UniProtKB/Swiss-Prot annotation, chains A, B:
Pfam families: GLGE_C, GlgE_dom_N_S. The record marks D466 as: Transition state stabilizer. Alpha-maltose 1-phosphate binds at K250, Q310, D345, N381, K520, Y521. Keywords: Carbohydrate metabolism, Glycosyltransferase, Transferase. This is Alpha-1,4-glucan:maltose-1-phosphate maltosyltransferase 1. It comes from the Bacteria. It catalyses: alpha-maltose 1-phosphate + [(1->4)-alpha-D-glucosyl](n) = [(1->4)-alpha-D-glucosyl](n+2) + phosphate. The keyword Aminoacyl-tRNA synthetase does not apply. Its EC number is 2.4.99.16.
């Protein structure tokens, strides 16, 4: 048995881990299946993609084409349907009809062996007809066979009868395929739309309190949901909602020692009041949590809970499961670190003494929150827990509940980030916040929208509680505006952490990416009504960005993205497409100075000719322009961060 | 069961066809095995390559290192021994000692938890000792354990006892490896030296005749072997040695109709006198062929026969096995074509009616020539016969006779050329003759010496009977000289077709790559004695090039090759290394004008510092120079094509 088949079909992509893990898609998403296909000799080959659904049912006829001449690299676009585990195969075959046609077009006007050539064509078309299941189409090919064989007609007329568009049509859907050879099947995991597309908002329920009771409850926090739904968010991400330890608890601004009223850091999970399956008593009860989830659902919001597999020193696990921790020779457990950062309030888990116990307990915890309507988990720092552990835990949850989405908060080196996605994480955080220049954004989004998109789905948080970038610190509100536009239009999933609207940008100290007076360490009441009234919020821009996304399918996918050149370093331009929808975005990356630029569009990449000039509407303002090959733009920070334009007909 | 192991080890290279075919090497050849290796958390990893021989016996301890910081890409050099099918595995592991050392070096001078830290180190070294098989080395580690634990000594002194070079040495050979995780094994086919390294000469025995008998015999042709051995060739490649058809036989200069004395084209195989298992009666008998092989062997020459799986219309197969040919409707067999070229004297084989019959007969033919001492086959135009057919035929021959080498003469698109090598061809012809500028040579040799070298071994024929390049046509003898130097020093296998020495360069017509009066169509007597006497041959340069190769191991491998910049487009410079041997070549690609250039050497790539200046001998002239960072060279066509320098100590 030979590794290569009769008609070579090699290096089918996408492929993840040499076929040991699936390529990814979501319902409705298109991507390209490709292969290297060729044969011996000089005759033509053809190829097609057979996509099989979870019950092994084949998809539609999907013929491939050569992507660039002489490369023998073939491709076709496939579209994922129903969720589940699919497979795809490339079928390669000799294409004797294409070959015969080419020779016949030369030899017949030249008078060379014409009867022999036409009889050869008749024989191919007879064979074509044999594999055609419909009676009417079979008659069309047999009438072509008869015409080809009618020696009473000129040679040119006999040939023309085999080249009619109706004969073409039949052969396009039912070609004659010699020596069909298929690749071994490759696996495709198709997941729900929210895995790829969604707008996220992170906030701390405890901060949304009242004058009488400053520590918010689930009931007070639910009153913030409508303002979040109105900005057009889909997912609400909550920091840990569990009891918080007292031993080594941190104070305000990450001081070592908490005073008596200090609330501590939610990620320092557990006290005698309960662990990862409990509610912080100040937030209320499980029934209050159910009320919160219900009110979320009614406004079109899903809840994403933080899952941080670690413990405060007061978590029950510390005494009940000591082997879940690494102990030094004096019996102490060293607190967690991501140096030079220290987390004195937190003990990390050791996994090598009782891997089974940890997996069992982890999936029980997740299912408990799942039973209370949580179908999305934002997994804290997963790169400090074993990769195979996440692989197991994710396979177990999605095995019974394939709708559950896991987001990996792994800000680390590329290999690890890539592997976590590859072993099951539906979504990943990214380097976005550290990509601010044109060159950085262009290079990074070319990476994420290319081959990486077969295994990673990016979630572009413009900020997090741990990341207030220098760009926002120095640029003020115009920088917040720019970064919202970029995040919302470049990834089908994006997010902000509360206060981003208010352009909160005071760092702990120069050169830091921590916030001063971080919410991680204190209640952070914000006067939302006042901020709305005084117009010192960019909620309206955020709202419009999410509406634009909801109205334009091109913004709800990742893979189709093209950068168009401008003549100013500070002005970036790009387009995204889905079917007839084309969105074209131009952003001034300078938050302090007005920039003017000539944007030169790659017209064929928009589906247009060079001379063509086609109308656009800037959805940020309602204003209409006519744009083609070369366009003047003028963007003033504070008044116009960018144009976000849709193409109309 | 999880796809990723405890310590991730991913994307092991080399890999061919995702592990379905082996990577290649020859006895004595080094190459790099690499992998992506990392772990969770911030502690160090280590890795090593376990090479297993054909009986499953592990090779030596082969620790890998990170190739560039922060990439998590690790590598080590391995060296192939005995021929056969090997395997390689990468083992990844936590490296707790490296981690502990790093922390201990900081914390001990700082006075932080010193007793605890030193006790932790003692415990690692005790564990280290447990897996150490030698008593003396185990004592060295246990003395380090005791020193670490001696609370009567300063903390700095207790630590220094664990960092002694003798403790280092023990741990370098027997490190403490946590959580060892291996990759699945990948296959490696190791073949004999001649698969990679060898100088080849092609000639037509029939042309080396006498005055009485112009058509040479094996006996007259044997008298040419000494002149070939003296030029330092290892392999003699003969065009087909079988009877030649009469029907549609070609005349001189590829005319359609042969006249009565015309000898026809050897590749038009077969007549009633015999087929592929017979000798042309004008060449003599099988016993004469055995004499020829014996005389070859005595001079250090192996014979490579042409194997062209095709037939003249007079080959016995045409009537005895009609299903081995594709017939048109009137019963005729269309002659072979590689358009716009036509081979009216030749019928191609069809493979789809009796694939088994063709494989059986093909291997019988090969074994017959093998029984007569032919262990190398130059396979004619293999890309017009199915890829899986060669896969089968090669697996069958090498299954009993792994020393047999197949050379694929496939001048076609990259996918096919690559696949043929990948499915078993030991050697391939290449694009060399169409790479003549500096940029072309540099780009092409970077491709062949890189990843392609894991599956392809190039054979650089500077010319063939079908390829007289324009560069030789226009450049005359200085161009022949340049191309000999380039071919001989850039690939460990190279070749010429007879008459290249004589600088034969008259084309059929302008714009053609055929020779005028091609040997394919006629006897081509050459007066070798006269050419030697009159000095109108470049045999002496060829001889010296082969001697240089025989004396410098760096020229007998492929993978180590580096191009150094010069300041003239026409002057190329490069170096190759094997252990202590370094060869440095500078060539003037201009055959009409003297070129002067400053060659700027990449010194660290030579194993040297920038300021260093090290002596070289130009092996073409015996002359000695001192070369470093920046060197004046002056190359005059006719007198000095190039410098071929060896580094001495
Ligand atoms: O026939 C049209 C073609 O002819 C002329 O080019 C010469 C050339 O100057 C010579 O060097 C020589 O070519 C060698 C190559 O040097 C050698 O590499 C090999 O070439 C292979 C390529 O390396 C490989 O990529 C592939 O070729 C593909 C290619 O990627 C495609 O882009 C496409 O090529 C077309 C070109 O795009 C187009 O510009 C034009 O080219 C002219 C050329 O300008 C002219 O000066 O047409 C071509 C072909 O239709 O398709 C090819 C697949 O054919 O594989 C090839 C090997 O086939 O081999 C050749 C000679 O053996 O000779 C050519 C012509 O003899
Ligand atoms: O600490 C030394 C380092 O610190 C300063 O850089 C800033 C930088 O200006 C910010 O952008 C930000 O970095 C982000 C990155 O933008 C983001 O991409 C991600 O970075 C990852 C890389 O993308 C990825 O390649 C890998 O990094 C490797 C890297 O390939 C190696 O070459 C090596 O990096 C070293 C550099 O070679 C060396 O120049 C120096 O770098 C300075 C930097 O000049 C300074 O201005 O030291 C580094 C590291 O020792 O090793 C790394 C592996 O760490 O993976 C990284 C992710 O770790 O993430 C960061 C922030 O999350 O912040 C940095 C510092 O915070």
């Amino acid at each position: 048995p030979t590794v290569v088949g009769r008609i070579p079909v090699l290096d089918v992509r996408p492929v993840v881990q040499r076929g040991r893990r699936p390529a990814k898609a979501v319902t409705g998403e298109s991507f390209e299946v490709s292969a290297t296909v060729f044969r011996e000799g000089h005759d033509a080959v053809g190829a097609n993609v057979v996509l099989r659904d979870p019950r092994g049912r084949p998809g539609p006829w999907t013929p491939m084409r050569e992507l660039a001449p002489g490369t023998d690299r073939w491709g076709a676009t496939v579209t994922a349907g129903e969720t589940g585990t699919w497979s795809y195969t490339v079928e390669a075959w000799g294409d004797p009809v294409t070959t015969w046609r080419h020779h016949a077009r030369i030899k017949i006007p030249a008078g060379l062996d014409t009867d022999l050539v036409l009889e050869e064509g008749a024989r191919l078309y007879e064979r074509a007809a044999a594999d055609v299941p419909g009676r009417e189409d079979r008659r069309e090919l047999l009438a072509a066979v008869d015409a080809l064989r009618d020696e009473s007609r000129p040679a040119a007329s006999r040939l023309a009868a085999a080249l009619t568009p109706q004969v073409d049509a039949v052969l396009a859907r039912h070609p004659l395929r010699d020596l069909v050879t298929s690749s071994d099947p490759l696996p495709l995991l198709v997941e729900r739309e929210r895995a790829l597309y969604g707008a996220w908002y992170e906030f701390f329920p405890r901060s949304e309190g009242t004058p009488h009771t400053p520590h918010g409850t689930f009931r007070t926090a639910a009153r913030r949901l409508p303002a979040i739904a109105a900005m057009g968010f889909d997912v609400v991400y909550l920091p840990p909602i569990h009891p918080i330890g007292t031993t080594h608890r941190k104070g305000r601004n990450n001081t070592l020692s908490a005073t008596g009223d200090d609330v501590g850091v939610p990620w320092a999970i557990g006290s005698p009041e309960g662990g990862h399956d409990s509610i912080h008593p100040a937030l209320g009860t499980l029934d209050d949590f159910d009320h919160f989830v219900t009110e979320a659902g009614k406004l079109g919001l899903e809840i994403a809970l933080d899952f941080a597999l670690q413990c405060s020193p007061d978590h029950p696990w510390v005494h009940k499961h000591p082997e879940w921790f690494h102990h030094r020779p004096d019996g102490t457990i060293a607190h967690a670190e991501n140096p030079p950062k220290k987390y004195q309030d937190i003990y990390p888990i050791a996994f090598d003494a009782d891997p089974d116990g940890l997996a069992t307990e982890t999936v029980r915890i997740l299912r408990h929150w799942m039973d209370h309507g949580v179908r999305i988990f934002r997994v804290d720092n997963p790169h400090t827990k074993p990769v195979a552990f996440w692989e197991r835990v994710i396979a177990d949850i999605n095995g019974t509940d394939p709708d559950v989405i896991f987001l990996a908060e792994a800000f680390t080196r590329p290999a690890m980030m890539a592997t976590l996605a590859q072993i099951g994480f539906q979504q990943s955080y990214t380097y976005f916040t550290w990509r601010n220049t044109k060159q950085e954004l262009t290079e990074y989004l070319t990476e994420l929208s290319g081959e990486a998109a077969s295994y990673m789905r990016p979630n572009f948080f413009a900020n997090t509680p741990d990341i207030l970038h220098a760009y926002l610190q120095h640029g003020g509100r115009p920088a917040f505006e720019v970064r919202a536009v970029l995040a919302a239009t470049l990834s089908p999933t994006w997010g902000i952490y509360s206060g981003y609207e208010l352009c909160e940008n005071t760092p702990l100290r120069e050169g830091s990416e921590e916030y001063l007076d971080s919410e991680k360490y204190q209640l952070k009441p914000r006067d939302w009504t006042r901020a709305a009234r005084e117009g010192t919020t960019i909620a309206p821009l955020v709202t419009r960005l999410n509406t634009i996304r909801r109205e334009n399918p091109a913004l709800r996918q990742l893979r189709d993205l093209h950068f168009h050149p401008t003549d100013k370093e500070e002005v970036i331009a790009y387009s995204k497409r889905q079917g007839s929808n084309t969105v074209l975005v131009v952003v001034n990356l300078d938050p302090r100075h007005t920039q003017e630029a000539t944007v030169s569009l790659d017209m064929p990449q928009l589906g247009l000719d060079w001379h063509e000039s086609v109308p656009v509407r800037d959805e940020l303002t309602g204003e209409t322009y006519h744009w083609g090959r070369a366009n003047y733009v003028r963007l003033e920070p504070g008044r116009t961060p960018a144009h976000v334009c849709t193409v109309l007909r």
